[PDB]
Design a binder for this molecule. Structure first.
Ligand SMILES: [N+]
Ligand SMILES: [N+]
Ligand SMILES: [N+]
Ligand SMILES: [N+]
Lengths: 23, 23, 28, 28
């Protein structure tokens, strides 16, 4: 449900932050 | 670096939120 | 600008999680 | 209580990300 969709949002954000770390 | 450690924090949180969804 | 937008998104999620928690509490 | 603590953690991370962004900006 909602909490799973938010969890997926947080994992998407984790990938953005890693991409920012390395750019 | 910092942003990777924060990304790992967000992935840990995503797993907590999924566990909360299903309990 | 990118990190600042992600920061707003996390604050928005925090508010959403408190709304979810409150609704669960209310219902039970 | 668990979702409320996670919400505080996300708000804390948001502040940390703005501090990181600002330091990068300052330095450049
Ligand atoms: N949920
Ligand atoms: N970093
Ligand atoms: N945002
Ligand atoms: N917390």
């Amino acid at each position: 449900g909602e909490l799973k969709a938010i969890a997926q949002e947080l994992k998407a954000i984790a990938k953005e932050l890693k991409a920012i770390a390395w750019e």
